[PDB]
């Protein structure tokens, strides 16, 4: 029915993220129905588990007349880091909360940096605690500082919606301040475009298995990740080996002959021309010229602490783990930042990875770092080199 959008509040400690998350739920419920959530209920965030990594995060849900929002608010800076790198749902947009009394702070910069790194596509800013500021020239100064900050990290600072308000006075009931929270909900709907449906994205099928039907040819199996493959359409086999071009000669679902295969369907794609021996672990079927194979990439990664089931010892320059992209582990070489000799468990770093085999890759692709068969960390492709 109504579109679902994943948002969240980012910004420095005590700028007003939780108060704002409360005010959003409260004002939207007071204006056009729903259940209002108190500050206390969002503040003491429960602990969530993302494959062994522990993250304190509050998941609040609210509705505007057209959209349904799944909103994340975390207590500490460490949770934001973990959540942006491996968190359950990738943000479609973010609300950057900036206290007009403090202006941009170290975590303001960090969240903006991580946001682009991790591929958060839209940022709306709520200039909080304006009830405390009597100087209009001061508000303009903070606003200009925030727009400069966003532009520094490739966000369109000059075109970013900035709402001047007070999250506390709005949670309190003050109509004049409650208007500004409605203006913010308006920007969520107008500035963040409708999220792209999996079925409307270019066709991609990560290859889970290969078989060869007698007389029909090679069958490649998997769950259609995105788009639609119709019988007769041209396809590319991208991964370890040099990219191959073929044609979908059939689509099968447990004996049922389909004319097409859509996103979320477990399907068997027939390829006339391709031989079984040409298909390798980690290959992908995709709409020709929509994905490129790469070996070298820049990534933002988090290494599990011993407590999270990860290693107890640090790793060094010579570390060569397995990178689990979609279907298989691929061994990679690591380049640590200038001056970094070792990486401790529980740390996050910028890692330049060189895979032994190319992998169909785009910025924003998430992966797992495994040493045995055990997860030692998680990452996101920031830049494809
Ligand atoms: N003056 C003023 N203080 C506010 C406002 N919103 C929140 N605060 C207060 O600032 C403190 C920090 O708020 P909080 O949401 O917990 O910050 P967070 O850690 O960034 O989420 C709390 O004691 C709030 O009541 C506001 O609009 N104006
Ligand atoms: Mg908070």
Residue numbers in the entry: 9 to 393
Task: Cite, word for word, the article reporting this structure.
G-domain proteins generally function as molecular switches by alternating between inactive GDP-bound and active GTP-bound states. We provide structural and biophysical evidence that phosphorylation of EF-Tu at T382 acts as an efficient switch that turns off protein synthesis by decoupling nucleotide binding from the EF-Tu conformational cycle.
On the basis of our structural observations on the link between the switch I region and phosphorylation of T382 at the β-barrel II domain, it is tempting to predict that posttranslational changes in EF-Tu, perturbing the switch I region β-hairpin conformation, would be an effective way of trapping the protein in an open conformational state. T61 from the switch I region is another major phosphorylation site observed across bacterial proteomes. Therefore, we hypothesized that during translational arrest caused by T61 phosphorylation, the underlying molecular mechanism would again be decoupling of nucleotide binding from the EF-Tu conformational dynamics and trapping EF-Tu in an open conformational state. To test this, we produced the T61E mutant to mimic E. coli EF-Tu phosphorylated at T61 (EF-TuT61E). In addition, the phosphomimic EF-TuT61E was significantly less dynamic than the wild-type protein. Using the phosphomimetic T61E mutant, we showed that the effect of phosphorylation is again to trap pEF-TuT61 in an open inactive state or at least shift the dynamic equilibrium toward a dominant nonfunctional state. EF-Tu is highly conserved in bacteria, including the key phosphorylation sites T61 and T382 (8, 18, 19).
